[PDB]
Amino acid sequence: GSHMDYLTGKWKLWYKMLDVNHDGKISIEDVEESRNKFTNLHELLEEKAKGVKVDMENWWTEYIFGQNGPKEISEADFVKRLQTAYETDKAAFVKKMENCFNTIFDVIDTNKDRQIELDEFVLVFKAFGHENEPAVTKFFGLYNAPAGIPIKDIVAYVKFTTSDNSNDTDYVNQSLKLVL
């Protein structure tokens, strides 16, 4: 239904952000390119960087790939598995999406002040291959928190990945059509 058609569009858009190497699959080269450029661009040294790399890779294997999952994920396979999950238990699906973005936004939280500064936010996109800096910054401005968007803005990506309502004012859906 239309609930699903609007959601399918957001899920496909979210797939293109995750596919860092624009090859139509989610694979280990995506995990490696994103984690390597995240640590390098935060001026991290070898130990703290590898610890950040373990954290990034655990996020991918838990919330994207899934245990007992395929080695590579197409967009079709990605939307098929998210659709099946939403149809079987929506409440559980929302919780998993909450748990997902809670994990990643803590990685993005580099100073650990439990908020997402402008610098932390532009760099996760830059690490994930997205260099539209005026569009990331205008995206940041939409949340009226100039010096710090609190990490309970995973509720924005919860809306983006779980809401079935085409009427929502979704700043994530709006700005990712500009950044990527």
Distance (Å, whole) CA 83 – CA 108: 27
Q: Does 30 bind Ca ion (CB under 5 A)?
A: yes
Contact present, 107 and 55 (Cβ < 8 Å): yes
Q: Does 119 bind Ca ion (CB under 5 A)?
A: no
Q: Does 111 bind Ca ion (CB under 5 A)?
A: yes
Stretch that binds Ca ion, among 4-12, 73-81, 108-116, 123-131 (CB under 5 A): 108-116
3-state secondary structure of 26: strand
Q: Does 19 bind Ca ion (CB under 5 A)?
A: yes
Beta strand spans in the chain (E): 115-116, 149-150
Q: Does 83 bind Ca ion (CB under 5 A)?
A: no
Stretch that binds Ca ion, among 25-33, 40-48, 58-66, 139-147 (CB under 5 A): 25-33
Residue nearer to Ca ion on the CB measure, 59 or 86:
59
Distance (Å, whole) CA 83 – CA 97: 13
